[PDB]
Design a protein around this ligand. Structure first.
Ligand SMILES: CCCCCCCCCCCCCCCCCC(=O)O[C@@H](COC(=O)CCCCCCCCCCCCCCC)COP(=O)(O)OCC[N+](C)(C)C
Ligand SMILES: CCCCCCCCCCCCCCCCCC(=O)O[C@@H](COC(=O)CCCCCCCCCCCCCCC)COP(=O)(O)OC[C@H](O)CO
Ligand SMILES: CCCCCCCCCCCCCCCCCC(=O)O[C@@H](COC(=O)CCCCCCCCCCCCCCC)COP(=O)(O)OC[C@H](O)CO
Ligand SMILES: CCCCCCCCCCCCCCCCCCCC(=O)O[C@H](COC(=O)CCCCCCCCCCCCCC)COP(=O)(O)OCCN
Ligand SMILES: CCCCCCCCCCCCCCCCCCCC(=O)O[C@H](COC(=O)CCCCCCCCCCCCCC)COP(=O)(O)OCCN
Ligand SMILES: CCCCCCCCCCCCCCCCCCCC(=O)O[C@H](COC(=O)CCCCCCCCCCCCCC)COP(=O)(O)OCCN
Ligand SMILES: CCCCCCCCCCCCCCCCCCCC(=O)O[C@H](COC(=O)CCCCCCCCCCCCCC)COP(=O)(O)OCCN
Ligand SMILES: CCCCCCCCCCCCCCCCCCCC(=O)O[C@H](COC(=O)CCCCCCCCCCCCCC)COP(=O)(O)OCCN
Ligand SMILES: CCCCCCCCCCCCCCCCCCCC(=O)O[C@H](COC(=O)CCCCCCCCCCCCCC)COP(=O)(O)OCCN
Ligand SMILES: CCCCCCCCCCCCCCCCCCCC(=O)O[C@H](COC(=O)CCCCCCCCCCCCCC)COP(=O)(O)OCCN
Ligand SMILES: CCCCCCCCCCCCCCCCCC(=O)OC[C@H](COP(=O)(O)O)OC(=O)CCCCCCCCCCCCCCCCC
Ligand SMILES: COC1=C(OC)C(=O)C(C/C=C(\C)CC/C=C(\C)CC/C=C(/C)CC/C=C(\C)CCC=C(C)C)=C(C)C1=O
Ligand SMILES: [Fe+3]
Lengths: 488, 75, 100, 123, 79, 494
């Protein structure tokens, strides 16, 4: 009996460690004897340790995660794809946590519950990746969402943070209701919620004239929920406001991990299921809309956070092009784009968090940065050029596959749109470089140097961004492996 | 020649220096950290090369199974 | 005709929630209430289908969805409370400062 | 010494959101925002540059038309910032961006109303 | 003056910059800051999804794809 | 397949030289200005000598690629990349390696404020441009060309003289990136047919007349922006004027040549039928550019603006030559490319000598400089003559060989192209006489200094090269004929 639970050792450990940290934090934060010490950094270090131990347990027990698969079948499904997805999610959570300590001590954000909520949301996203039934998927999505709602409003006396939370909760709850409605329609039409059963029922028919309008609209509503989650246009406008109004570590965490988890879900639901061309057209139209609107709106922005939010919207458009074309290379390119976008976003938010110690808000606040911190201005410039997709930086991979998918599938309008939006993006990315290197403002802002954690993370992500295309084989192989494991 | 150990050691040393520079510290502020970084970089690079070999090995079998499943169509 | 009548009941509840979103641009509390109405309609959809299909999966998920609805309302009303506390008012013109 | 700071000083009066009138001091050639930040009437941390690209109307002031005729007319960008920063999205005809008003000797005695501070410190 | 700094600038960097600035301006204004607009947009997107992707069976008798995309673009030139 | 070459001096080490210089300079404190200056200068000079050696081991009888060596990207070996040169690319490698030390020398006096970033940017540019000229693969040609945009952007924006450098840099980056994206689209369409981007294979595949038309247009959209051809030439005056002196030298002398190199290297041999179909189109565009841009040059009031507009007329003559598709045409196009790279660079250096002292580009302020700067006046006159294609100078050889090539194909295009002899003389002599001749205007300028030793030394190799190519172009043409001949014949078998 005990050995059956080897399939959930990683999750058991992280949940138990989260409980231990909750108890530790609440017991000593309330201690008069110890004079109510702030425990955000102490619990943060212990939680980083817990995340790393979870990663060790998961990575080193690759075969064991598939033990007792028949017993666990109606609860979740662990395979090669979920293996690598969960590893990448844990690595992202560890990096995001490591970027938070200067924020904890200098702002004096003393709430250790922040770390606990991050860990519980990580548990939720882990269960999201392995979900193999509509019920499990919904429950894990809701756990993740509720944790985000709470942490988005963590600055509870701030107008901005409270506004972010309110908008997030209302729009999140609305989208979740729409998705749940879709799930109910699919169950009513097919008598099934398990992904295997849905695959068997729906395969071979798609729209064979006598199409289940119940099945067709259930798929549509579920897709609407998914598109809200990935911040695809027109279900996107929550994202810029929430990203700007939340505390910056929250914004960094939301920018990466939920995308990993929800794309895992989207792959395993749609790609593994079957209504077909309709849904790929959904993601097609939403990709084009996201690219255009992200480019234009980002061009309008004068503030750093809003610029990065709109940039992420545009990039999810680029990524969803891969899901749309419905090929093994499409899935592989989508995974490559997520990995690279995640490492670039981690780099960018490490810089943003470093600069938030002097309250960076506007793009113009970067003036004369090439004088006051030359190596920081260069590092940030490499990130921008990578965001623009200039070769041979890592960001060039997404542009290359965008045009690779258009030319082959025959999509000349998509290629047109990609060219235009890439040029617009390059303009608003090099505007930052111009501000740091070319401008001569009358008043300068002198920034405090970053802590060791962010400097090390920045140093590694900056080598990756510059040097990835010298040795890209492991990512290429691992992502081809994952794309294949979805069906075999 | 240019071995994974040497590339990794150079990358680790560069990482420590880049980290010091980002913090506006002298390049060689804590030299024992430079030694630690060279060691970790060498270890990382060697493990990445071995992992790459293993990854290609697994992808080979998996492509083989995909090809067999596809070829079953023409039976 | 039973199944079409049970489904249109839940359907009118869902459409009422949608209309409540549409008609309450100055009243975000009612917007939250409309979202609960939609969640209730979905829950009813699972229960009706469970009976019609003679299957228990609709019933397990209905209970779990009730748990989600409870947690959602708790957290949402907390966020409403803190927004009101910061502003002293619930009017929508005082929660429009993030834009662009 | 034939060149004094007194040669550039511009006498000003500011009415705080509570309505009380205060006599403040600024240099000619510098912005109204700087004069207002000298005594903390506007928080200097909320508006650190004198550039329109780093402005969310934290510098906004209200000036009667007798002094408005003595200023250059509002540019399109200024009105854009003022209107979008308005809670009701309405452009106040007596509103000026303090960071865009350069003090001169001709503005001696100008009366300025400082509205209640808007939230500025993005999490 | 008529070509290099005239027509080629207007149907080039000068004109392009002008139009893309005005359009980025308009798209930024859609992010109005009102939660009601964001919910309305989601409802409109959901309605669009149902309408185009399932209720375009009979439509085709009255409707053409040409007119669809023409009226879309034409909307840009309103007021 | 490992294509490793026997030769000791090869292409990879010449790639590595400025890279190593840049890494070393990364770590040297800005207080050690002398060390930074010397290290950068010496790295550039060693690269130049290495390229000279590469010229000696060159074999002028084969139509093949030489020093071919290979470069292996994945263990799967599906994608493996090759470097190699021929008689069309050799002298461009040499010109790049020669110009970079000149750029380091021009900023010698201001290096205390320039810093190591200036030298590092120029060394990185050198590495990227040599790579571009040495690539036997469409996709890496793409990757290495776009990469130069970043350091060029930085060079223009940081060390440009005035705030117009902002707009100039934006326009340079955006125009060039648009063209580059068009050619990326072309590269992917080719890859879908062939499954490869290796230049040698594409030279041996057959493209449909239809597929050739589309691929040619997509190549043209990059290359015409690069050349530049009208009407996408307007980025060039802004960028080449607002850049610092060495930045202008690199822009005019090397970066402009990349479009004509792309025409010579991929478009003409890969799609000969499309090349034939588009020849009247290219002839018309180039002839319009020569006449209209020369006449615009005549009415410019800024020194740098006059020299920058002159380059548009010269490059479109180059395009006429290369699309004539015979020995005179292609040989003259290559020779004029190299000669322009020397002459326009020297002219930008002359204007920079004037601007460093007086800080104005407006012609009206100058005048009568022959009486205070006779050495500068003489050197300026020599390069003015070279820019008019005076026989005896290097530019005349390429100009006349291109007119020969064009006349044998179409007498009208040769006739329109020979009008350049009249218009270029007009603007060149007008510029020279308004700057150097006449009386001084002491109310504008009253203090003067002729060239120092560094400036004289900088000018010496330009003079030597101009005269050397002008009087004995056989040294260059002998190393190029086999490659040029095989380019002209490619696609036909009679
Ligand atoms: C070719 C790529 C495509 C195009 C993209 C180009 C992107 C860059 C744009 C080029 C234009 C010019 C760029 C100028 C940058 C050069 C100046 C520079 O970065 O110098 C840095 C140097 O920045 C670095 O630290 C770079 C370190 C990266 C390490 C990479 C090398 C890896 C192996 C080396 C092993 C160690 C050294 C071996 C020899 C001792 C000095 O930084 P500061 O902020 O001035 O001061 C730092 C503080 N302190 C000196 C006291 C320590
Ligand atoms: C994609 C191809 C486009 C060009 C097609 C060929 C040419 C067709 C005919 C010309 C079309 C554009 C006509 C523009 C009329 C002038 C509009 C105007 O007012 O000009 C303004 C500038 O705007 C333009 O000229 C528009 C430039 C358009 C250039 C092309 C648009 C963008 C194309 C690229 C993006 C889309 C790519 C699609 C690719 C298929 C000047 O601004 P102002 O405020 O000073 O005007 C005051 C006024 O004169 C009264 O006093
Ligand atoms: C921006 C690019 C123009 C619109 C997109 C486009 O048409 O892309 C083409 C980009 O190619 C070009 O010609 C670029 C034109 C750039 C000028 C604008 C590729 O399509 P094709 O018609 O050339 O290929 C069809 C072929 O027969 C199938 O193998
Ligand atoms: C983030 C930054 C990337 C990190 C840098 C590179 C990591 C290199 C470390 C690995 C070196 C040694 C690995 C040891 C090894 O082979 O053991 C395996 C551990 O794998 C591992 O350690 C797997 C590491 C996987 C890395 C993350 C992959 C992300 C994929 C991108 C997709 C993202 C999109 C998600 C929607 C388990 O042994 P085994 O081989 O038997 O186990 C799989 C059988 N099937
Ligand atoms: C200027 C001239 C061009 C104006 C736009 C042309 C519109 C018609 C293009 C068209 O037919 O669109 C089809 C659908 O693409 C689409 O994706 C539909 C059009 C784009 C919809 C999403 C973008 C809407 C605007 C977003 C910003 C504004 C927000 C609202 C203010 C393309 O056919 P295909 O590419 O499927 O052919 C695949 C073949 N293998
Ligand atoms: C792939 C491209 C090439 C990459 C190059 C690879 C080379 C390997 C790297 C070599 C590293 C060189 C330096 C090693 C010596 C430094 C040792 C750290 C000292 C230490 O204990 O640091 C503590 C902080 O932790 C820290 O600062 C450590 C945390 C740093 C964050 C990184 C790890 C986070 C988790 C994983 C992130 C993954 C993200 C990817 C998605 C205390 O510091 P202190 O004593 O100065 O006091 C700080 C004030 N509180
Ligand atoms: C998910 C998967 C994500 C993993 C990310 C992959 C690393 C990202 C690359 C960014 C920094 C790496 C520098 C590029 C290496 C430059 C030289 C390339 C090279 O041949 O070095 C080999 C690999 O070294 C190395 O191992 C490179 C150093 C590692 C850092 C050693 O050659 P070899 O013969 O030992 O390896 C057999 C293949 N040449
Ligand atoms: C074999 C070469 C490499 C070995 C490195 C040591 C052995 C590996 C053990 C892990 C080392 C990781 C890096 C340790 C330092 C991490 C960053 C600590 C910096 C910090 O903020 O806290 C400092 C603690 O010092 C410290 O943490 C250092 C405490 C003493 C360690 C230094 C001795 C290293 C021995 C190197 C070879 C010795 C040869 C004989 C065996 C207090 O800083 P502070 O106030 O003390 O002063 C600093 C003057 N800026
Ligand atoms: C045979 C027929 C064909 C033959 C060829 C004819 C071609 C006609 C000419 C087309 C080429 C145009 C190339 C575009 C370059 C635009 C450069 C404008 C940039 C510039 O200098 O001003 C900026 C404006 O950027 C902005 O705000 C605007 C955004 C940047 C512009 C990029 C948009 C281009 C996208 C693609 C357009 C063409 C489609 C291709 C099919 C700065 O402005 P600021 O001062 O306000 O900024 C704040 C300052 N830091
Ligand atoms: C592609 C074909 C050419 C497109 C040209 C677009 C010109 C846009 C334009 O200037 O029109 C403005 C409306 O913009 C718009 O409504 C632009 C809509 C989107 C156009 C691109 C797709 C009205 O400006 P105006 O001509 O009245 O300005 C003079 C005032 N005195
Ligand atoms: C959130 C969930 C909260 C509840 C906590 C869940 C995990 C704690 C479970 C503690 C009981 C485990 C137990 O008695 O098993 C041994 C026990 C052996 O008994 P022994 O032979 O007398 O030692 O195993 C069994 O035979 C019973 C199996 C119970 C199912 C275990 C499910 C949880 C597995 C994760 C355990 C992680 C490591 C801890 C193992 C050492 C514990 C001493
Ligand atoms: C400057 O003058 C003015 C206008 O002009 C732009 C206006 O009209 C408006 C605003 C009114 C509008 C445009 C309402 C329409 C909003 C919609 C459609 C909500 C959808 C959400 C967004 C943000 C747009 C994105 C939607 C797309 C791209 C379509 C869906 C995506 C796919 C193709 C799958 C105002 C106030 C105005 O004063
Ligand atoms: Fe202001």
């Amino acid at each position: 009996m005990f050995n059956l639970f080897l399939a959930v050792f990683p999750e058991i450990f992280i949940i138990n460690a989260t409980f231990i940290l909750l108890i530790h934090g609440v017991v000593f934060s309330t201690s008069k004897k110890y004079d109510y010490p702030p425990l955000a950094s102490n619990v943060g270090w212990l939680g980083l340790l817990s995340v790393l131990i979870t990663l060790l347990l998961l990575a080193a027990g690759a075969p064991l995660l598939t033990i007792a698969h028949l017993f666990w079948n109606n609860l979740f499904r662990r395979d090669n794809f979920t293996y690598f997805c969960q590893i990448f999610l844990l690595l992202s959570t560890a990096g995001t946590i490591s970027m938070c300590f200067d924020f904890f001590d200098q702002e004096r954000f003393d709430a250790f519950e922040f770390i606990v909520l991050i860990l519980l949301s990580t548990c939720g996203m882990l269960f999201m990746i392995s979900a193999y039934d509509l019920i499990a998927m919904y429950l894990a999505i809701e756990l993740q969402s509720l944790c985000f709602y709470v942490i988005a409003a963590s600055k509870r006396k701030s107008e901005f943070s409270t506004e972010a939370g309110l908008k997030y909760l209302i729009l999140g709850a609305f989208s979740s209701g729409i998705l749940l409605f879709g799930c109910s329609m699919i169950y009513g039409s097919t008598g099934a919620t398990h992904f295997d059963q849905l695959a068997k029922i729906l395969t071979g028919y798609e729209i064979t004239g006598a199409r289940s309008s119940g099945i067709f609209m259930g798929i549509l509503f579920i897709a609407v929920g998914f598109l809200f989650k990935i911040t695809a246009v027109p279900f996107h406008m929550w994202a810029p406001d929430i990203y700007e109004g939340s505390p910056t570590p929250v914004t960094a965490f939301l920018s990466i991990a939920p995308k990993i988890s929800i794309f895992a879900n989207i792959l395993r639901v749609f790609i593994y299921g079957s209504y077909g061309a309709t849904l790929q057209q959904i993601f097609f139209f939403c990709s084009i809309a996201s690219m255009i609107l992200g480019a234009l709106a980002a061009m309008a922005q004068t503030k750093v956070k809003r610029l990065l939010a709109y940039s992420s919207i545009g990039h999810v458009g680029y990524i969803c092009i891969g899901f749309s074309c419905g090929t093994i290379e499409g899935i592989q390119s989508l995974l490559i784009g997520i990995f690279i976008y995640a490492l670039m976003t981690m780099d960018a938010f490490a810089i943003v968090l470093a600069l938030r110690q002097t309250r960076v808000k506007y793009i113009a606040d970067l003036g004369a940065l090439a004088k006051t911190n030359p190596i920081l201005a260069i590092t940030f410039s490499i990130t921008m050029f990578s965001y623009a997709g200039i070769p041979p930086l890592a960001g060039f991979c997404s542009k290359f596959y965008l045009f690779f998918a258009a030319l082959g599938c025959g999509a000349y309008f998509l290629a047109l749109v990609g060219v235009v939006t890439s040029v617009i993006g390059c303009f608003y990315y090099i505007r930052l470089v111009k501000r740091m290197f070319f401008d001569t403002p009358r008043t300068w802002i002198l920034y405090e140097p970053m802590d060791r954690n962010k400097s090390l993370l920045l140093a590694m992500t900056s080598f990756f961004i510059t040097l990835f295309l010298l040795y890209p084989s492991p990512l290429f192989s691992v992502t081809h492996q994952m794309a294949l494991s979805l069906y075999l | 020649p240019i071995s994974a150990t040497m590339v990794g050691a150079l990358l680790g040393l560069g990482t420590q220096m880049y980290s010091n520079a980002l913090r506006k510290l002298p390049y060689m502020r804590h030299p024992w950290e430079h030694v630690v970084g060279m060691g970790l970089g060498a270890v990382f690079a060697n493990q990445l090369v071995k992992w790459d070999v293993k990854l290609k090995e697994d992808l080979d079998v998996m492509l083989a199974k995909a090809r067999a499943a596809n070829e079953r169509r023409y039976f | 005709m039973d199944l079409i009548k049970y489904f249109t009941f839940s359907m009118i509840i869902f459409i009422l929630g949608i209309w409540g979103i549409l008609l309450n641009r100055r009243n975000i509390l009612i917007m939250l209430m409309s979202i609960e109405l939609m969640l209730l309609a979905v829950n009813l959809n699972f229960l009706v289908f469970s009976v019609s299909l003679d299957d228990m999966m609709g019933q397990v998920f209905a209970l779990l969805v009730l748990t989600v609805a409870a947690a959602e309302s708790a957290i949402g009303l907390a966020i409403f409370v803190i927004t009101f506390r910061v502003r002293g008012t619930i009017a929508v013109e005082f929660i429009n400062s993030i834009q662009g | 010494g034939s060149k004094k700071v007194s040669d550039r000083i511009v006498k000003l009066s500011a009415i705080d959101p509570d309505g009380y009138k205060q006599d403040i001091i600024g240099l000619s050639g510098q912005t109204l925002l700087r004069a207002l930040t000298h005594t903390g009437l506007i928080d200097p941390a909320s508006h650190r540059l004198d550039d329109i690209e780093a402005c969310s109307a934290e510098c906004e002031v209200q000036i009667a038309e007798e002094w408005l005729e003595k200023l250059p007319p509002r540019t399109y960008d200024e009105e854009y910032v003022l209107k979008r920063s308005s809670r009701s999205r309405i452009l106040n005809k007596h509103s000026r961006l303090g960071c865009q008003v350069v003090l001169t000797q001709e503005l001696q005695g100008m009366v300025v109303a400082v509205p209640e501070a808007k939230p500025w410190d993005i999490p | 003056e008529a070509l290099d700094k005239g027509a080629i600038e207007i149907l080039g960097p000068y004109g392009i910059s002008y139009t893309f600035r005005r359009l980025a301006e308009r798209i930024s204004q859609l992010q109005s800051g009102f939660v009601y607009h964001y919910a309305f947009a989601m409802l409109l997107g959901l309605t669009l999804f149902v309408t185009f992707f399932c209720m375009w069976d009979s439509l085709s008798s009255w409707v053409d794809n040409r007119l669809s995309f023409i009226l879309i673009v034409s909307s840009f030139y309103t007021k | 397949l490992e294509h490793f070459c026997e030769c000791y001096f090869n292409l990879s080490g010449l790639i590595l030289c400025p890279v190593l210089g840049s890494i070393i300079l990364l770590f040297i404190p800005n207080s050690r200005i002398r060390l930074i200056r010397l290290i950068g200068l010496c790295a550039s000079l060693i690269t130049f000598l290495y390229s000279l050696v590469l010229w000696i081991q060159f074999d002028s009888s084969t139509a093949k690629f030489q020093f071919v060596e290979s470069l292996r990207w994945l263990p799967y070996e599906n994608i493996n990349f090759y470097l190699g040169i021929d008689g069309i690319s050799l002298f461009f490698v040499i010109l790049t390696t020669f110009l970079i030390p000149i750029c380091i020398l021009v900023g010698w006096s201001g290096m205390r404020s320039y810093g190591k970033e200036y030298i590092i940017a120029f060394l990185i540019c050198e590495f990227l441009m040599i790579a571009v000229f040495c690539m036997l693969d469409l996709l890496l040609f793409y990757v290495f060309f776009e990469s130069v945009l970043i350091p060029m952007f930085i060079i223009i924006g940081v060390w440009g003289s005035r705030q117009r450098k902002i707009k100039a840099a934006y326009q340079f980056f955006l125009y060039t990136l648009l063209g580059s994206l068009f050619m990326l689209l072309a590269i992917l369409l080719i890859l879908f047919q062939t499954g490869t981007t290796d230049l040698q294979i594409l030279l041996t595949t057959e493209f449909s007349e239809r597929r050739q038309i589309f691929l040619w247009i997509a190549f043209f959209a990059s290359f015409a922006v690069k050349v530049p051809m009208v009407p996408v030439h307007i980025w060039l005056p802004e960028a080449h004027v607002e850049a610092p002196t060495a930045g202008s030298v690199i822009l005019a002398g090397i970066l402009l040549k990349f479009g004509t190199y792309g025409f010579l290297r991929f478009s003409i041999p890969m799609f000969p039928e499309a090349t034939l179909c588009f020849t009247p189109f290219i002839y018309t565009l180039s002839a319009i550019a020569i006449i209209y841009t020369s006449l615009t040059t005549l009415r410019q009031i800024d020194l740098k603006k006059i020299i920058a507009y002159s380059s548009v007329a010269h490059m479109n003559l180059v395009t006429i030559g290369m699309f004539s598709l015979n020995i005179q045409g292609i040989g003259g196009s290559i020779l004029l490319m190299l000669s322009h790279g020397l002459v326009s660079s020297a002219l930008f250096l002359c204007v920079g000598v004037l601007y460093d002292r007086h800080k104005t580009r407006l012609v009206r302020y100058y005048g009568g400089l022959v009486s205070t700067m006779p050495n500068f006046s003489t050197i300026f006159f020599f390069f003015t003559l070279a820019n008019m294609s005076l026989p005896g100078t290097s530019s005349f050889i390429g100009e006349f060989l291109i007119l020969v090539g064009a006349f044998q194909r179409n007498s009208l295009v040769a006739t329109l192209a020979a009008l350049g002899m009249i218009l270029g003389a007009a603007y060149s002599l007008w510029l020279y006489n308004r700057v150097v001749s006449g009386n001084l205007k002491p109310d504008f300028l009253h203090k003067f200094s002729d060239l120092n030793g560094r400036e004289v030394f900088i000018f010496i190799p330009f003079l030597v090269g101009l005269v050397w190519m002008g009087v004995y172009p056989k040294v260059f043409l002998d190393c190029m004929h086999t490659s040029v001949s095989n380019l002209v014949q490619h696609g036909k078998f009679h």
